[PDB]
Design a protein around this ligand. Sequence first.
Ligand SMILES: [Mg+2]
Ligand SMILES: [Mg+2]
Ligand SMILES: [Mg+2]
Lengths: 91, 244, 266, 93, 233, 87, 203, 104
Amino acid sequence: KIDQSLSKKLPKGTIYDPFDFSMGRIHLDRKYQDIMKSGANPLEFYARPRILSRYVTSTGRIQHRDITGLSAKNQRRLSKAIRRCQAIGLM
Amino acid sequence: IHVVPKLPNSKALLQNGVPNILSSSGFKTVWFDYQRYLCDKLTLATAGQSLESYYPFHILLKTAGNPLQSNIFNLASSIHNNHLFVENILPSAKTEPSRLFLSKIKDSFNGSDWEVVKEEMIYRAENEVLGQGWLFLVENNEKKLFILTSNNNGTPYYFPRNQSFDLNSAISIDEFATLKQMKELIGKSTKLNGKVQDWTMPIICVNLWDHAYLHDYGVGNRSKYVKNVLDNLNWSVVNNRIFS
Amino acid sequence: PYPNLIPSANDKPYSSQELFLRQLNHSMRTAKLGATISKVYYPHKDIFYPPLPENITVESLMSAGVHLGQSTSLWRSSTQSYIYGEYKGIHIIDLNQTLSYLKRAAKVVEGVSESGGIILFLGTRQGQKRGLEEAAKKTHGYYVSTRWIPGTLTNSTEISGIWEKQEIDSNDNPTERALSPNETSKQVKPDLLVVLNPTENRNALLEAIKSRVPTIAIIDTDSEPSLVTYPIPGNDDSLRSVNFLLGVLARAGQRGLQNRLARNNE
Amino acid sequence: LPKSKSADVAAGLHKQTGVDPDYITRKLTMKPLVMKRVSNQTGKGKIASFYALVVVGDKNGMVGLGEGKSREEMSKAIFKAHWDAVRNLKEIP
Amino acid sequence: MKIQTNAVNVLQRTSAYLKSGLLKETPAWYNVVASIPPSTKFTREPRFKNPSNGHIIGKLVDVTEQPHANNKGLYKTRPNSSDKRVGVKRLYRPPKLTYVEDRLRSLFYKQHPWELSRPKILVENEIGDENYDWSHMLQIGRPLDGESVIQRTMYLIKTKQYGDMVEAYDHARYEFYALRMQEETEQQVALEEAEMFGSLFGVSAIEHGIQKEQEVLDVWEKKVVEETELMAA
Amino acid sequence: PPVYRLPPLPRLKVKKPIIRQEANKCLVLMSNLLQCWSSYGHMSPKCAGLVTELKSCTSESALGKRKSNINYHAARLYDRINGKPHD
Amino acid sequence: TLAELLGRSRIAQVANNHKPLTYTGKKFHPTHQIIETKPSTLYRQEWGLKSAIPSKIKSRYLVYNDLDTLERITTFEPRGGTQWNRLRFQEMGVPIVSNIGRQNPFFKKFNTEIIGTGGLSYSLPGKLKNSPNGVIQRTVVPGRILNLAAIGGFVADVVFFQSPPSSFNSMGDFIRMKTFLFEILEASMEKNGSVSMHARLLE
Amino acid sequence: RRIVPKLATFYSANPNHEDRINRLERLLRKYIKLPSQAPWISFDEYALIGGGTKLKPTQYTQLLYMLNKLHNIDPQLTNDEITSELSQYYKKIKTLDEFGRSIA
Ligand SMILES: [Mg+2]
Ligand SMILES: [Mg+2]
Ligand SMILES: [Mg+2]
C-alpha cells in the first residue's frame, strides 16, 4: 500500500510517456496548478452573498487581485458590490 | 534525392544489353527502369527523414532492426543488391577468377571444383526460393565462403534480415531449431535498438527477381538464366570484393 | 600501409584488426554503391567546398539561414535599413542587401590576401572553431576561438611579446634566418580583422578602430553596423550560416592568395 | 651599457604601434599645457601624483593632446603625456 | 549607440599619417580599401510596399476617392482623426509579413493533431535546386505532409480549377488522405512479408517503450519507498 | 497573468541556495523508536529490532553519513536573461 | 521574390503556436510539431532554427514555440514522444473506427474540429494479418495496470472474467512494476480527440 | 620579405598550446575510424615547451585526453606519424645472515 501523493493516476482517454510514471513528473504537476471572469459586472451580485462570498476569506476579508486574478476594473466592481452587501443586512 | 548511378559504357549497354546473359530490353527492364523506380520509391519513403543523407547500404544497416519501416529496408536492400548484381554482370569498366578465390572455395566446400560449386549454387537457387529473391555467394568472419539464398529483399549482410527461408510454406525441424537459435542470439545482443554484430560480405550476388530473366528466358528457365550469369560475370570485380 | 598488422593463420578466422581492414576495404569499394544522393546538405561540405562570391544566390543564403535576424524585442533600430520585414516574431534580414555586402567584404578579403596582408578570423562562439581554423589555413591567415585577451593590438608588446615571429618570401617559404631581438619585439598588426560575433567581442572591434585596422563583421538585427568597416547583414547565431559566410570569405581570400603566388612565379 | 627622452619615446612608439621614430623625434614638437600635482586620500595617507597634459604637433595641421600621470616625479608624468599625445595624433583641417 | 565615425574612416586617418611621415610604409589593406569604399551612410530608409502581400504603405485614401456611402449609410465628407495624424512611423518600421498559407497551415494541424507527431527536418537543402509541379502532391525531394496539401491548394487557386479556396483545400486534403492510406498499407504489408520469410526483429517499438517505462518505474519505486520511510518517521 | 519585470540590477543572486538533502537515517530511526515508546509502555520487545538498528547506525558517530551550483548560473545568465535594451 | 521563398520555406511551414510546452493537464493528442535533426547536423548544433541549440542536447528530436525570445533563448523542449505513441499504435494494429454509425471522413466555412482521427491511423478496418503461426485473431500486447491500463503509449479501459487476487493483492499499489499481457478489443475516438481503447487482461 | 607570426594561433591567449592541440586534433580526425583496443609529460614539463606561465589546468587535461585517445588506437593499426607526434609527450634486497637470523 502507498499514499496518493506519490503516484500519478493517468486519466482514461489520455496519452502517457515513460517520464510520466516518474517522481519528477509528479513534482512538475504539483508545481504547475468563473462568473465574474466570464464578463458581467459584479455589481449585479450585491443581493447575492452566496456568489460574492467566493471572493472573500474565511473571516470575511476581500481577496487581493493577485489572489482572485481579475481585471482591475472588474476587481474594483466586485469589491464595491461586496461593500454594498455588508452595508445591507445580507452578507 | 537518390538517383541511379552512371554505369561505364552506358550507351553501349543501352544499344546491346549484355553479350550473353541479358538483352537490350532485358537489361533496361532490370536496371534502366526497375532500378530507377526503386530509387524513386526510396526517395519518396525517405524524403524528409534523416535517412535522406545516407547511402542505400547504410540505410539498410540502420533500418534492419526496426520492424516498422520495413518498406525502406526492402527498397534499400533491393537497390544495393541490384547494383551488386549489375557490377557482377558488367563486361568491363578476358578476366579469369582469382587463384586466392579458388583456394578459398576449395577450403570451404570439402576440396571441390569451381564448376561443382556453381552447380550446387544453381541447385540451391532452384530449390530454396519460390517467386522472387536473391542468390549470394558470401564470406563471413570465418574465412570460408558459403551459399546464401534470400526470398525477395533479404540482405546477405545482416543475418536476422537474411530472409533465407519461407515460413508461409511448411518448414523442417532443423530449420526451426536454427531460427530459434538465431532469435536467442538476437536476444543476447543487449542493446536498446537490439542489433547483433555480423561480418558477412557478398562475393557473387545474383538477381533471382523476374525483372532480370522473365523478358529473355520466359517464366521458366530461371535456373538456365542463373547458369548463364555464372558463366559470364565480371571476375575482376569479384576478386576486388574478396580479400581483407 | 599498416606495417604492424599481425595477420591471422589461414586455418584460423580473421583477427579483429584484419576484419576492420576488410570492412574499410568494403566501405571504400562497394558500400556507397546502390545509388547516388544528389541535392542534399552535408554540413562539412560548406567548410571544405564553399562557393565563390559570384555563384552565391539569395536562395543559397536563405537555405543557410542567413535571413533569420535576432528578434522583434531585441532590436537595435540602427540596423533598420538592412531588415526586410518581421515574421514569426523575428526580424528578417534583406538578403539581396546581405549578398551585396558579402560580395564587397569578399573582394576586400581577396585584396588583402593578394597584397600579402595578415587576415585574422575571430570567432568566440562554441561550434565555430574548426571552420575558423580551416579558413585561416586556406589563406595563409590567422584565427582566434579561445577568447580575445583585451589589448592584443593596443597593448601588443605585453600580450604578444614572447611568441615566435618569422620571415617570409614573396612566396610563403619560412626563409629561416635569425630575427634580431629588436626586429622581433615590434608589433605585428592584422590588415583585416574579420569577426563572426561582433556583439560578443565589442572590445576587439574597438581596438581595431583604435589600432587603425579595417574590419568585417556579421551584423545581426541586434548589432551596431557602424562599429566596423564592412558589415555583412546576417544570422550570426546559427552555426551553419556563419560557416557559409566565413567559408565564402576564406575562398575569396584563397583565390587572391593563389593569384599572388602566380604573379610571384611570373 | 648606458632630446634623449623624446628619442626613447619615439623608439617605444615604433615598437608598440609601428610609428616612424625619426618623424617623432624631429618634426613633432611638444608643449605642456597643464602640470598639476594631484592627490588621493588613501588609508596609508594622502598620496600625491603628478599630472601633466601635453600638446604635441607637427606644425602642418597634425596635432595631438595627451595626458599622463606618475606618483614619482613630474618628468615621468610628462613623458607619459607626450607618449599619449603621439598615440593620439590627428589631422585638423 | 552613437554612429561611430572611426570604424569606416580608416583609410583617411592612415592617409593623413602617411602624408605626415608618422607612417613610413603603407599598409597592405590601404590600396584595397581605397578601391572598395565603405558605405558610411547609416540612414533609416523608408519602405512603401509590404513584400509578402503587396499592400501599399505610403498612400492615403481620400474623401473624393470614397464617394459612395459607408457602412451605417453615412457619406464621408471630411477627413477623420486618423487621416490627419502624420503616419511616418509606418513608412520606417519594417512590415509584418503575412501569407494566406499560414492560416491554412494552422487549420490543417487543428484538423489533424497527429500530423504534428510526424517529425520535421527544418535544415534546408538547396532551395534553388527544387522544381515542384503542384499538378500532383507527391514531389520527389519533398515528403508527404500538410505543407504539400497547402501547396496543392494554392496551385488549384492559381489555376482556377476550384475558384473557391475552401473547395481547393478540401480537394488537396482528400488527395493527401489516399496517399497516407497507401503509405500505411505499404509498411504493414512489408512487415507481414518480413514475418513470413523468417526475418527477426530483436526489439519491437512497443517492447522498447515497455523497457523504457520499466527503468523509470524502478527509479520511482526506490525513491517512493524512501519517501514513505521519511513520512513514517 | 501579471508579469513583473525587474529594473537593471548589479547582480542576480540568491543569498542562500538550499540544496535540500534527504533527512538522516539515524535520526529517523530514533524518531520511530520514540514513537514506539509513546505506545506500548517504556521498553517492550515490539521495538526490539528498531533499537538494535539505531545502535548499529550510531556506533561510529551520532549521525551516519556526513552544494548546488545555482548562483553560478544566475551570475552567468543574468546578462542574457535580462530584457535590458541595447547599448 | 525573397518574400515568396520565405513563405515556402521550412520555418514558415511549421504552423505557429504559443501553447505551453509544459502542460500538466490531460494530453489527448500532440500539441507541438516534432522537429528532428540528422546526426551530422546535431553534431554542429544546427536544427534549422534562428540560432544554434545548446550542446547539452544530445537527442535528435525537439519541440519549440519561439525562434527567439526577449530572454535571448529559443523556447524549446528536447522531446518527441508523440511520434513513438503513434508508432506503437500502428504496431498494435487495432484500426480506429467511429462507433457511431457514420461514413469514414477520409472518403467522399472551415471546421477546426478533428477530421476523423487526427492522423495517428490511416489504417482501414477490414484487413487480417497472417503470420507463420497463422492468421492472428487476437492482438496480444504487453501493458501495465495502474490501479485502467497503460498499453503502448495509451491509457485504456480494461475488463476480465475474474479479478485475479494473487497478482493484484500481493502488491496493491505497485501493480505498475509487473507487465501483463492484453487483448485489445477495439479503439473508438471521441469528439475531444481522445483515443478510447478497450483491452482484456490475459493470464 | 615580410616579418610575420609563425603560428596561426599567434593572436589567441595561449598560442603555442593551441597549435600543439591542433596537430593532435588533425591526427585524430585523420585516423578517426581506427579501432581503439600512460607515461605522459607532467604539467610543468609541458609548460616549458607549451604555454609556460599561460598554461592552464583545463588546457593540460585536454592535451592529455587528446594524447590518450591517440595512444589507444590498436597498436597493429597505428601509424608512424602518430607515434612521432606522441614521441614528444613521453617521459637493495634484504637477506638473512651467516647464522640465519634477520636483524632489524
Ligand atoms: Mg546575435
Ligand atoms: Mg583620456
Ligand atoms: Mg549615451
